[PDB]
Amino acid sequence: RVASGAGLPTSRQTTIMVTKYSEKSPITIPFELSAACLTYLRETFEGTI
Amino acid sequence: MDARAVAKRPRDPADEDNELVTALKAKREVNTISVRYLYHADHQALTARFFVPEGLVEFEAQPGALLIRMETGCDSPRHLYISLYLLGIRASNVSASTRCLLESVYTASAARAALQWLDLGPHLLHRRLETLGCVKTVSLGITSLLTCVMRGYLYNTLKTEVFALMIPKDMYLTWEETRGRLQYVYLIIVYDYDGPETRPGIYVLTSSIAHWQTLVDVARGKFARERCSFVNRRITRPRQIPLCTGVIQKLGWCLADDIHTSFLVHKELKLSVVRLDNFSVELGDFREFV
C-alpha cells in the first residue's frame, strides 16, 4: 500500500489468495507386433543359418 | 492462583511496554517508525470521524460546537450534519438582528438546503434531528472532515488544550441566580403552537438539577404560555393530532466556575457566545414533556 495526504481516503489491510490446479493429459501410442515376430522371438527352433 | 499474584501490585498499563515494543524486542529489529510512546493511549474521549460538505463547516474552524445530525426522507442523503449555530434560523428564540447576521454567513448551498429540508415533512424537529456531541478538529479541504466526541472531555491530543463548547447567547438559559457547585446542561426544544409560526424555541438550559421529574416539573412552569398555546391549538383546530409540546435531553455537565462569555470570530463577523470550558459529553435521548 502507499500513504496519501489528509482529506483523501486510504487503502486498508488487503490480502489475496489464489490457487492453481493440475490438468491430466495422458498419451498412448500403442505399437503392434506382427505375430510372426512374436512367435519367432520367445521360442527357439532348429539350428539353420 | 497463588498468593503472590494477588499480592503483587497491579501492572502499570502505561509504563509496561507497548505491543509493538514487545513484538520488536523479542525479535530485535529496527524500523524507521518511532514507536516507544503511542499517542492517544491514555485517552477516554471516544471520537468518531465525520465527513461534511463545505456549506456546513463555517463557524466550525474554531473548535467546540454541537454537531447535531438530521435525516431527510429523500434516499440519496440519509443524514446530514447541522451545526447548532446553523439551527438559529429555525430557532424562534433567536433575535432578528442575530438571525440577519448569521444568515449572512451560511450563504452556501448546503445550509439553505438543510433549512428547506427542516420545514417540509409532517413531523416536528425532535423526530427529525439527532444529537451527537461536540466537534474538536477540522481538516478543511473542500469536503472537510470532522471528529466529534460522543463521550468524555474535549481535549487536543497530548492533553495540552482543553477545548471549549460555545453556544450562541440567544439559546442560553439559566433559571437561578444562585448557581450550584456542579451543574448539568440540557437541550430544550419547545414548540409554540401557532399556525404559521410553528418554528420551535431552542434553548440550552444550564441548571443544578440532575433529576428528571423535578426538572420537567419546573419546566412546565416556565413554558406555560406555550403549554396553553398547545391546548389552544388543540381546541381551536380539532381532528389534528400534535404531540411533544416540549422535548429535553441531557447534553452534559460543567463545573459552573468557568461558564463565561466570549465571542466567535468568523470572517470578521463577531458573535457573542456563552462559553463552557471544561465540558463533558454524556448523551441522553430525546425525552418529551407536556
Binding site: - | 498499563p13 471516544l46 465525520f50 439527532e130 381546541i235
Partner: protein, 282 residues
Amino acid sequence: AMEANIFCTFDHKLSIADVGKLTKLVAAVVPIPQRLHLIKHYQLGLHQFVDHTRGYVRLRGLLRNMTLTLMRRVEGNQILLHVPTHGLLYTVLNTGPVTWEKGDALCVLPPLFHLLTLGQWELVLPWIVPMPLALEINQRLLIMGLFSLDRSYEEVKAAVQQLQTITFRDATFTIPDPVIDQHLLIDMKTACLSMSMVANLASELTMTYVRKLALEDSSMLLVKCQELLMRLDRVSPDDEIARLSALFVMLRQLDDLIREQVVFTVCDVSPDNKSATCIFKG
C-alpha cells in the same frame, strides 16, 4: 490482564464445520438470564424463552432485564462471552434485518422474521434495530392487535395489509400477524385491553376530577382543559378508590410498550455493512 468473560460451555458433540459456522458470529449480541460465570447453551439466547401460546410482548417484557453480552472468542468446547459495561465501546454485528447508518440510536427487539440447530435447540439471536423503526413497529403491532375482533370485514383485511408492511431506507419489510386463527393471543389481548381500559376510564373520571379541581384552579390552563373535555362530552367512594387503583394497575401492566431505553449508539459502521462500532449505554 483478563476481563469479565463468562465461560459458556456446550453439552453436545460438534463437527469442525459447526465451529466454522459458529465462528462467524463473533461480534453479536446475546441475551443472558443471569450475570453468572459458567453457563450451558440452554440458557443462551431466546429459544429458552419462546412459548407457543405467548408472543412478542411477553418476550419483550423478559427482554428489558437481560445482560446483553457479546461473544469475544470461540474455542475448543467453550465460548467466551463478554459482558459490556456502560461507557466503553464495542463492535456489534449487523445481524438485524434492517441496516444502520452513522449516528443512530439502537435498541433490542425479538426476531419477528426468521444460526446453530440441534435436536431440541436452535440458537436464536435478537434483532438490533434503530429507534424510529422500533417505535414504528410498536405502533404497528398495537394497532394490528386492535383490529383483531373486527377481522371479518373486507376492508379491514386491506387495512391490515397496508399496516403489515413498514418502510425504512430501502427496506420494504413486513411483519407477521399477531392474531392467529381469528383470535388474539393472551399477550396482545392484555396489551390492547390495558389501552382500552385506560382510555375508557380517562373518558369517564377526568371530568369529575377536573370540575372538583376547578375551584382551586390557579392557572390559565386547567380551564381550557375542562372546556375541551366539556366539548368532547357532547356512588360510594370505594368504587372511586377501586377505579383509580384499576387505572394505575392497567398503567403498570403497560410499560413494556410505552418506551424503549437506548442501548447502543453507532459511531462508525464497517464498509459493506456487516458490523459497526457502538458505545454501550444503559
